[PDB]
């Protein structure tokens, strides 16, 4: 499919940025995670980033570590996540769905078979957190054979060589983690990279507008959503209320 390409062309026509929340699939359990995600979409998420619980998430901070722990406590498995993903795609035909994965869960039962399963359930992109571009070839190849965008992180400590490779090899969007912000954004455009989403510290509306003003296509809230989950474990009702309120505010901040 071309879900990201379509999304970005539509947002551009509306002079709007993308707002993209991250959650862990299955946190705090399957039924509640499904409602959480539907709430995110109803409240105006333009795309999703979705994590699959992994034992050793070595790229993630405490909030996400704790989300994984909550999903394992609930017995959530990758197979059950893939069941969830098929259901989510079936409810929502055009929203781009991106996974955040660790390499072992992709390599475990074969790289090709992993991406084939992504294609079957209707995922659009995969970011493998612990695969640098230097090691990415077999993941990118399998991704593209199955119509999945391989997503690469452009770190604060990026250099020009890395900008060129990330521009060349990534598809869908480029994951920015903040040579000033405006230089990175400009150079990525110069090298015809996938549109940049700012993923560093996006926890309030002002950061969403800042990201768009700097020339990024949008922003990814890496952990703020999960924090709202964490905060409201004991009242799933209010959890949903607070999620809707936050996402709506954040999406509003992306509008022309």
């Amino acid at each position: 499919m071309e879900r990201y390409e379509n999304l970005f062309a539509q947002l551009n026509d509306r002079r709007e940025g993308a707002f993209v929340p991250f959650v862990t699939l299955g946190d705090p359990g399957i039924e509640q995670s499904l409602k959480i995600i539907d709430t995110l979409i109803d409240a105006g998420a333009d795309a999703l980033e979705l994590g699959v619980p992994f034992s050793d998430p070595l790229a993630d901070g405490p909030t996400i570590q704790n989300a994984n722990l909550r999903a394992f406590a609930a017995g959530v498995t990758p197979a059950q996540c893939f069941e969830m993903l098929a259901l989510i795609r079936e409810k929502h035909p055009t929203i781009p769905i991106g996974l955040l994965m660790y390499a072992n869960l992709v390599f475990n039962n074969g790289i090709d078979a992993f991406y084939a399963r992504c294609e079957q359930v209707g995922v659009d992109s995969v970011l493998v957190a612990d695969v640098p571009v230097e090691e990415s070839a077999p993941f990118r190849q399998a991704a593209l054979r199955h119509n999945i965008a391989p997503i690469f992180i452009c770190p604060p400590n990026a250099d020009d060589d890395l900008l060129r490779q990330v521009a060349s090899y990534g598809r869908g969007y480029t994951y920015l983690l903040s040579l000033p912000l405006h230089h990175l954004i400009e150079k990525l455009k110069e090298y015809h990279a996938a549109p940049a989403l700012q993923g560093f510290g996006i926890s309030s509306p002002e950061q969403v507008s800042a990201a768009v003003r700097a020339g990024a296509a949008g922003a990814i809230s890496g952990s703020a959503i999960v924090k709202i989950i964490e905060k409201n474990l004991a009242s799933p009702k209010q959890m949903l209320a607070e999620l809707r309120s936050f996402v709506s505010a954040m999406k509003a901040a992306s509008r022309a």
Partner: protein, 395 residues
């Protein structure tokens, strides 16, 4: 791009978030540079000799082989400062840190041995050292935690995941990804992302270099086999490296069989663990059917690592080295045997290597063979563990 090959055949690599690549590239460049620098080599040699006590003895153990055609020597890394072989490479990695202008050290530890080695090297060379250790290990390893604190290291309990070594390994990398401009990550075994398997091998390889010169002097020929226990792989690769091109010399690695391969409670990953990608590398892992990383098990804390260094996986795959396992009971017997017959108390880790050598001898007592066991450490630390088993078993 790297200066050196990050792979041993299909095994190894640099599977870390993009943010950490410049740290690994920096480290590799500094290592390559150091290896060509006579001044660095002279400083490392001076610490090895005058601080750690190198060369270590090569002891001929006559009582334990009496009435067989096995001649057995022990390479006595148990006599190194700190009482395990780990000291050699932490001194080299400390010197690399200083070479790179770093003034802080991060290290992971499970059993505590590497945390104590890192702390002593740091205190000597004036580096501020912080050690990540899973909460469950902290509780289990009071004596080593206290040694670390006496040497002025900060010990940071890790409460994420399973609260054990792999979790402390994750936290050390999280920290380094933010701090690498000022801090060096002092990885504790011949595993992890490149360049750490290469560095750790080269900063351990004096073990086999010495062994070779000492056996030539004493016996006038090379050993038939060198035998070493295998956690992550450092003491074994240190013994093996200088013998790799001596094709007549057997290289035998001994992994922990725990309660027995068939019980699933072990750390023998070369034959029994499926290849995965984790800890920054492609290597056999202890893991669930769906790819979650799991805990290994051994009577011996130091061998309880749920993977194995990639150069061992490679040496196995090409059949240059052979790997076996020894169970908790076997290792306990070998521990008792060496205490009583040679007056040396071996680390339970090292007792796995000795146990395999004893089986080589006992199974074929009229086979002529000249064996060296790498006695990677001393077993003072294991006397309470051994005590509790014996009393429970009614001994």
């Amino acid at each position: 791009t790297t200066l050196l090959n990050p792979y041993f055949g299909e095994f190894g690599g640099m599977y870390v978030p993009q943010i950490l690549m410049p740290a690994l590239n920096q480290l590799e460049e500094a290592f390559v540079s150091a290896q060509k620098d006579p001044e660095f080599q002279a400083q490392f040699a001076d610490l090895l000799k005058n601080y750690a006590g190198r060369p270590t003895a090569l002891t001929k153990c006559q009582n334990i082989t009496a009435g067989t055609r096995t001649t057995l020597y022990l390479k006595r890394e148990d006599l190194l400062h700190g009482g395990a072989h780990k000291t050699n490479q932490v001194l080299g990695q400390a010197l690399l840190a200083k070479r790179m202008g770093k003034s802080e050290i991060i290290a992971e530890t499970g059993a505590g041995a590497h945390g104590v080695a890192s702390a002593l090297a740091s205190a000597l060379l004036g580096l501020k050292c912080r050690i990540y250790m899973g909460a469950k290990d902290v509780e289990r390893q009071s004596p080593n935690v206290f040694r670390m604190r006496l040497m002025g290291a900060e010990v940071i309990p890790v409460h994420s995941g399973s609260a054990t070594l792999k979790d402390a390994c994750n936290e050390a990398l999280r920290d380094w990804s933010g701090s690498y401009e000022t801090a060096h990550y002092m990885l504790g075994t011949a595993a992890g992302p490149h360049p750490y398997p290469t560095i750790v091998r080269e900063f351990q390889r004096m073990i086999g270099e010495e062994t070779k010169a000492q056996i030539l002097d004493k016996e006038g020929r090379l050993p038939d086999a060198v035998i070493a226990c295998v956690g992550g792989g450092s003491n074994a690769i240190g013994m093996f490296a200088d013998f790799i091109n001596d094709t007549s010399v057997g290289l035998i690695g001994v992994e922990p069989g725990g309660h027995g391969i068939e019980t699933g409670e072990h750390g023998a990953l070369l034959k029994h663990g499926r290849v995965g990608i984790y800890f920054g590398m492609k290597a056999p892992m202890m893991q669930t059917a769906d790819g979650q990383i799991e805990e290994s098990y051994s009577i011996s804390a130091g061998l309880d690592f749920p993977s194995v260094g990639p150069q061992h996986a490679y040496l196995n795959s090409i059949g240059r080295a052979d790997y076996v396992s020894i169970t908790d009971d076997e290792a306990l017997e070998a521990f008792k045997t060496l205490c009583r017959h040679e007056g040396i108390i071996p680390a339970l880790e090292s007792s796995h290597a000795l146990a395999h050598a004893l089986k080589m001898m006992r199974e074929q007592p009229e086979k002529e063979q000249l064996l060296v066991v790498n006695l990677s450490g001393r077993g003072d630390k294991d006397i309470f563990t051994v005590h509790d088993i014996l009393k429970a078993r009614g001994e």
